Design an enzyme around this catalytic site. Structure first.
Site, short mmCIF file in Angstrom:
data_model
loop_
_atom_site.label_atom_id
_atom_site.label_comp_id
_atom_site.label_asym_id
_atom_site.label_seq_id
_atom_site.Cartn_x
_atom_site.Cartn_y
_atom_site.Cartn_z
CB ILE A 68 -0.88 -0.08 1.26
CG1 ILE A 68 -2.16 -1.01 1.01
CG2 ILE A 68 -1.70 1.61 1.33
CD1 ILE A 68 -2.85 -1.38 2.09
CG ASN A 117 1.48 2.29 4.21
OD1 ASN A 117 0.48 1.85 4.17
ND2 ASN A 117 2.74 1.67 4.22
CE1 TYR A 144 -3.52 -9.33 10.33
CE2 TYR A 144 -1.84 -11.29 9.77
CZ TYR A 144 -3.17 -10.70 9.90
OH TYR A 144 -4.41 -11.50 9.71
CB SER A 192 -7.23 -2.49 9.79
OG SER A 192 -7.90 -3.73 9.34
CE1 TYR A 202 -2.75 -4.83 11.39
CE2 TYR A 202 -5.08 -5.39 11.02
CZ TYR A 202 -3.79 -4.75 10.80
OH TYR A 202 -3.89 -4.08 9.36
CB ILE A 255 -4.87 -4.49 0.20
CG1 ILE A 255 -5.94 -3.41 0.91
CG2 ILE A 255 -4.66 -3.98 -1.02
CD1 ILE A 255 -7.53 -3.10 0.04
N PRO A 310 2.49 -7.79 -0.62
CG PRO A 310 4.67 -6.91 -1.59
CD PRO A 310 3.08 -6.63 -1.22
CB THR A 333 -1.87 -10.21 2.29
OG1 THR A 333 -1.89 -9.58 0.88
CG2 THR A 333 -2.66 -8.97 3.16
N1 NAP Z 1 -2.75 -5.68 3.30
C1 NAP Z 1 -3.75 -5.57 3.73
O1 NAP Z 1 -4.54 -6.31 3.75
C2 NAP Z 1 -4.07 -4.47 5.04
C3 NAP Z 1 -5.38 -4.47 5.53
C4 NAP Z 1 -5.69 -3.52 6.27
C5 NAP Z 1 -4.69 -2.88 6.87
N2 NAP Z 1 -3.46 -2.90 6.33
C6 NAP Z 1 -2.47 -1.89 6.77
O2 NAP Z 1 -2.05 -1.07 5.66
C7 NAP Z 1 -0.69 -0.87 6.32
C8 NAP Z 1 0.20 -1.20 5.10
O3 NAP Z 1 0.19 -2.63 5.04
P1 NAP Z 1 0.91 -3.47 3.83
O4 NAP Z 1 0.05 -4.75 3.64
O5 NAP Z 1 0.91 -2.54 2.68
O6 NAP Z 1 2.11 -3.91 4.31
P2 NAP Z 1 3.46 -4.57 3.48
O7 NAP Z 1 3.04 -4.88 2.20
O8 NAP Z 1 4.07 -5.49 4.30
O9 NAP Z 1 4.33 -3.26 3.29
C9 NAP Z 1 4.73 -2.66 4.31
C10 NAP Z 1 5.83 -1.49 4.07
O10 NAP Z 1 6.19 -0.90 5.53
C11 NAP Z 1 7.59 -1.19 5.71
N3 NAP Z 1 7.78 -1.49 7.13
C12 NAP Z 1 7.27 -2.36 8.01
N4 NAP Z 1 7.47 -2.04 9.04
C13 NAP Z 1 8.34 -0.82 9.37
C14 NAP Z 1 8.88 -0.44 10.30
N5 NAP Z 1 8.70 -0.94 11.72
N6 NAP Z 1 9.46 0.75 9.90
C15 NAP Z 1 9.61 1.17 8.71
N7 NAP Z 1 9.05 0.62 7.89
C16 NAP Z 1 8.16 -0.47 7.92
C17 NAP Z 1 8.01 -2.28 4.79
O11 NAP Z 1 9.14 -2.48 4.56
P3 NAP Z 1 10.34 -3.20 5.66
O12 NAP Z 1 9.77 -4.29 5.88
O13 NAP Z 1 11.22 -3.29 4.69
O14 NAP Z 1 10.36 -2.03 6.53
C18 NAP Z 1 7.05 -1.96 3.85
O15 NAP Z 1 7.69 -1.10 2.92
C19 NAP Z 1 -0.25 -1.44 7.30
O16 NAP Z 1 -0.56 -0.33 8.29
C20 NAP Z 1 -1.24 -2.46 7.64
O17 NAP Z 1 -1.73 -2.55 8.84
C21 NAP Z 1 -3.14 -3.62 5.46
#
Ligand code: NAP
Ligand code: NAP
Ligand code: NAP
Ligand code: NAP
Lengths: 246, 246, 246, 246
Positions: free
Chosen positions: B22, B95, B99, B147, B160, B193, B196, B198
């Protein structure tokens, strides 16, 4: 691509009550992104004046006189829209509404009937009438204009807010029942907005001001764009923080 | 005018966690509307790869390695951003998140601490650190990525969802306390969503599919535009109707 | 039959923070309906004074000194309760809490840690520790004492309200995950209540007054009765209409 | 004192639709705590049978035939109640309702009119008619029986749920406008309940079962007790966790 996701080019739209206030802003916002718009009001003279101004600006807007509180007129309206747009409607904006401000003790049966007809039944029946055209478009978006006061108690708003509360729920049912037809349905719930239709209110707004019609119209246009393809069943307040302010 | 209302030209933005999912979509959406973006992640090699791709495309994106769960690193991050942007930040997108999926019985103290630090404390402290820059910009927008499960019970999501529920409330406090500084704060609450990061979830979605990163990113960009000037304190679900589906 | 449905005869209960305010009212309400209650506070001298008064009145209340913000002490507390009640706990009331009132800019890392530990982690861990006893009782009821300000923005309440917002969500997860164990979980969200812990607030209350501890305690007792057997996962405000008042 | 706070001794009550299902349970619960109850239904033969059974049990229940969807009959009903109770009414329970299950496409104008009249207008007008008696009692409690589906989308429930959504909002307006008259107003929102009026539903309930009429009636009685004196404007779901279950 970004350009396409943020465009309404080649779309068709029906906006009820487009000669003033929020509805007028919504018509202009939609045509600004390339939509062809059909609109209406009860006032023949004001509608022609609006349509003439829009044609002068080369906007593609057409319209007819329609009281959306009348079943026969709603049926007639859906008939013309379907003919003008060849049976394909991308967008339906239920903006026409009515307002009565009285204490609960003061409301008459006639007040009740008037508010239910224009705020709830009109929107419901028009969704029914528009469903084939919306389905046929392949990408349908219904936006109801509700009110932020469907979540709090404002003096004098009892029946008004209750009809908007009904709209908020109807939003959820439409969103789920017609998802299969790739139709999305959402509600925009404005706080106090500067309109021809419209002290203590602004004291309750963190921003300390009432809103402008375009501050509602922008979100209406966004919700109809491809960019909003995963947004459905939502009630989004546009109220400068009014409803969540302590 | 419409053109200006729907533009992020001349704005500056910080997006945490922009190398994947995201966050990556949000960076590209923002630069697409003319923003200068600063981003970060914990992975040095992935960040340089992202930054190189963006510079190849002539996007104005810069960034540094930062673990937003670390107080010292958050302070360092806010320092660089303020220097790079000369003390003016239009946009803050919280962002980065974390999780863990376990039954309530299974959660460890370490699990709890990890989720609170990355999902709640990080966002809170960064808002504090960013407040002077946001205020100085004259038009500030904070968007938290929450979320949709902060409104319902999904198996395994207890801590979470609770941290995201906290974010939803913090949104309301930020919106009201900093309205005076012309800063708006809103939350986007995604359903499932494709990322990577999920089966039964999609059965619960009226649309019958998971969302795409750009379906969240579009709303994030919209909420930062002048067109969203009367939208603050809101939690908007982007979930294809998941949370309101019976 | 009615008599049984409205009784807590033969039940066992743990109420945290029972020496003052809402917690003290809850202990007395529960014993009034026949419950055996275990309670605690950080103050040895105040606890013995409370326990002595209750024994004088022939109430079955016992207790020990416990700081519920300490993991080791929570574990010790759950150990004594389980021994005293022979491994069967009908009722858990998470009432102990903490309060800090500062602008968002003012909050320290220490403030944040303190509020999360006492308002959220304590409740979560104690639910974990109590789950076997609650399950063993065959009829379990968890009641969290939240706050009505987890739905609106009150000046100075940002982290406090956010921790209570987290509790509200945790309520929903507990309710669903442990329904199988015939355990119900609900939250009571008080407005301003007259307590040792506690102008513009009462102006915002339709009733024009703050609440009394027993106005919260009554609902806590009701939610634990057989009469509440189909109520779970709810957040019920006890605020004289504060949060829904325009 | 506790005994008084949990009593309805010396109170008077009107419960609409008391010959079956939830309404019948509510009448018995109220008389169980000492209330004098007036009730009604459209069926003369069923009402006399109910009244005879209650008189056999020495309950103080009286009643008359009334279709609450008729304005003239509502006026007549309020007239008799006021005479029988000498102008003082403690309690009004708006339980009578109507149900139609069709897809949105299927709903007729007649369906719409029927549901609005019996679910919304009836409750609204009766509150108006009852306001003097409620005010005169010095301690007034209005309880609407809504539905948990006014928060989610259940197939076929569009207009039904929308009318209940309107009731939920009306609750908030009543609570605030009449707080000055020491009248409280709340809504109970049942999930599926076993009634003469009433597979996939129970799969959605964490408890895995439908509710019983007394599981709604208990809360109705509680909300009318002095113990509920700081509870007003609330919508409380009695649904075994149905609406918050993922
Ligand atoms: N995907 C879903 O289904 C979903 C649903 C509801 C909410 N969300 C929320 O949406 C947001 C984004 O989710 P996502 O699914 O896109 O995650 P993602 O695909 O895992 O991407 C996460 C990004 O954040 C970085 N990151 C993670 N931990 C970090 C930290 N402590 N400091 C700095 N950077 C960090 C990661 O890079 P590094 O690991 O390299 O640091 C990566 O760039 C989150 O807040 C998540 O809770 C996601
Ligand atoms: N303004 C606010 O503060 C505010 C706040 C919350 C919600 N809203 C809602 O926002 C929507 C628009 O409000 P507004 O303030 O913009 O109203 P407005 O300024 O009075 O404009 C209303 C428009 O609707 C038309 N209209 C009214 N009744 C109609 C009917 N029965 N059939 C067809 N057209 C009709 C009016 O033209 P004719 O009179 O010539 O027909 C006019 O074009 C309404 O649903 C309203 O409830 C407004
Ligand atoms: N009062 C209000 O207006 C209001 C409004 C909304 C919510 N609430 C919530 O209602 C609950 C009760 O509030 P209250 O106003 O009744 O508080 P209070 O009057 O200050 O009483 C608090 C009780 O908890 C005990 N306690 C505090 N911290 C503790 C800890 N770490 N471990 C064990 N015991 C502890 C206190 O005793 P020691 O200090 O001796 O330990 C005292 O017995 C809290 O969760 C609060 O957030 C209150
Ligand atoms: N049962 C559920 O699952 C459920 C779920 C959510 C909400 N509710 C709501 O709970 C309330 C009670 O439902 P229920 O299931 O108990 O209904 P029920 O079993 O059908 O009982 C309805 C009672 O109301 C009377 N009644 C119906 N229409 C009336 C009218 N126009 N005027 C006067 N009396 C009338 C009926 O008698 P006559 O027919 O003889 O008049 C009967 O006494 C309703 O508001 C309903 O919407 C029920």
């Amino acid at each position: 691509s970004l350009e396409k996701r943020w465009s309404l080019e080649g779309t068709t739209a029906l906006v009820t009550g487009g000669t003033k206030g929020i509805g007028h802003a919504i018509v202009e916002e939609l045509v600004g992104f390339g939509a062809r718009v059909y609109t209406c009001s009860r006032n023949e003279a004001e509608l022609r004046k609006c349509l003439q101004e829009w044609e002068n600006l080369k906007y593609d807007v057409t319209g007819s006189v329609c009281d959306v509180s009348s079943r026969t007129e709603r049926e007639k309206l859906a008939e013309e829209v379907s003919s003008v747009f060849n049976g394909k409607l991308n967008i339906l904006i239920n903006n026409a509404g009515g307002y009565v401000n009285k204490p609960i003790d003061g409301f008459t049966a006639e007040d009740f009937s008037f508010l239910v007809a224009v705020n709830l039944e009109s929107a419901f029946h028009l969704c029914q009438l528009a469903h084939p055209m919306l389905k046929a478009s392949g990408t349908g978006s219904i936006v109801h204009i509700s009110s932020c006061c469907a979540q709090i108690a404002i003096p004098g708003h009892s029946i008004y807010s209750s009809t908007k509360g009904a709209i908020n729920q109807l939003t959820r049912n439409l969103a789920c029942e017609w998802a299969k037809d790739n139709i999305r349905t959402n509600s925009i719930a404005p706080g106090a907005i500067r309109t021809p239709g419209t002290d203590r209110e602004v004291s309750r707004v963190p921003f300390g001001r009432i809103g402008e019609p375009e501050e509602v119209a922008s979100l209406a246009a966004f919700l109809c764009m491809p960019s909003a393809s995963y947004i459905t069943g939502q009630v989004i307040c546009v109220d400068g923080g009014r409803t969540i302010n302590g």
